Amino acid sequence: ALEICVKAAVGAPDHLGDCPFSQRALLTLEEKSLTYKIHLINLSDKPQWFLDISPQGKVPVLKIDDKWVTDSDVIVGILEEKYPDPPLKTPAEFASVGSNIFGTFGTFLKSKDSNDGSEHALLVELEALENHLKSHDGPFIAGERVSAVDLSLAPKLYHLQVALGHFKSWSVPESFPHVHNYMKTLFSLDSFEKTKTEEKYVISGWAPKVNPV
């Protein structure tokens, strides 16, 4: 059977945690309607058997056939070619849409400057996404149906929402109406709600990283 190791919630090791890469994998599993066992791994107190099969302690890790496989791109790619139906392949042209959002979001979230222009760098990436969404048929990045890029992007835009809302009182400006529509479309996906981290645990996951010693 399929099994997946993912991150446990910081301060609640028996609840699903806030790893965006783990969620991408869970989203894919749900979109292929596959059944899987879930291992909630506490990255503080990482159990021994887990280190035996992901020797870098990284998560997500999926047991498929025999082997345990790391790296969420690799994990989702194997699932696509092993369970072709329903298809999740994104046309290559759009496969990297939105790919610098999580990066610039992380940087703005941790900025103590405010003149370092990290907010502008994030706005530029949102803008690029608004531009894609408004000039290509929706509701998803590659059209009528959810595909790989949406599943990779959804967990990341959820962190952006929750984290910048909580930590900085900050929201995607109302001047990206397509981005707002797209996030609502993603967050109300069935597979999203089945695999989403409670807001609590995005907040606790990020709390020691926002402004560290």
Side-chain angles (χ1 to χ4, degrees), residues 1-66 68-213:
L2 310 178
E3 309 191 19
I4 188 180
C5 301
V6 297
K7 172 182 178 201
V10 175
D14 39 18
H15 295 261
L16 178 66
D18 69 306
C19 176
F21 308 101
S22 291
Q23 184 176 9
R24 183 193 177 182
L26 294 165
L27 281 165
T28 304
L29 284 164
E30 274 297 309
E31 285 298 341
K32 312 299 211 156
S33 302
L34 296 172
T35 36
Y36 51 99
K37 201 186 290 202
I38 294 188
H39 303 282
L40 287 182
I41 304 305
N42 182 357
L43 306 183
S44 298
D45 208 10
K46 319 221 287 275
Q48 175 50 60
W49 67 265
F50 172 69
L51 244 73
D52 282 311
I53 48 76
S54 169
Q56 274 55 38
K58 34 177 312 217
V59 89
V61 195
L62 165 110
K63 189 203 250 199
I64 196 159
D65 310 355
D66 221 18
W68 282 95
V69 167
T70 52
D71 191 336
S72 72
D73 299 288
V74 173
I75 282 158
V76 312
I78 303 179
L79 295 178
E80 180 65 14
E81 62 180 75
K82 185 145 302 182
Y83 308 102
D85 253 282
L88 295 182
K89 211 228 293 177
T90 298
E93 179 180 13
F94 310 136
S96 286
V97 160
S99 58
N100 279 314
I101 296 174
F102 193 66
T104 56
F105 142 69
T107 300
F108 178 41
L109 165 66
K110 299 189 270 219
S111 175
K112 328 149 155 44
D113 206 312
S114 129
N115 283 13
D116 70 341
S118 59
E119 198 204 356
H120 177 59
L122 169 60
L123 288 174
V124 172
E125 295 312 317
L126 291 168
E127 164 54 30
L129 180 63
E130 180 71 13
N131 269 348
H132 168 82
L133 300 162
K134 75 191 209 165
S135 53
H136 300 90
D137 303 357
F140 302 93
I141 288 173
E144 174 179 10
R145 286 184 195 91
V146 79
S147 71
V149 66
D150 310 293
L151 303 179
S152 166
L153 205 52
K156 290 160 156 186
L157 289 168
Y158 185 76
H159 281 230
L160 181 159
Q161 178 167 286
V162 180
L164 293 171
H166 170 66
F167 286 103
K168 296 197 155 211
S169 273
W170 196 98
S171 284
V172 177
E174 284 305 313
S175 55
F176 313 107
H178 286 269
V179 169
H180 278 277
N181 299 331
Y182 175 62
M183 289 160 70
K184 287 194 186 83
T185 292
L186 287 176
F187 305 162
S188 72
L189 269 180
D190 212 281
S191 62
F192 192 90
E193 341 200 82
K194 288 179 170 181
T195 65
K196 126 233 225 301
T197 313
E198 300 196 56
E199 305 204 358
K200 275 171 167 156
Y201 309 121
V202 173
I203 292 162
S204 65
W206 272 107
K209 303 181 179 177
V210 162
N211 194 344
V213 151

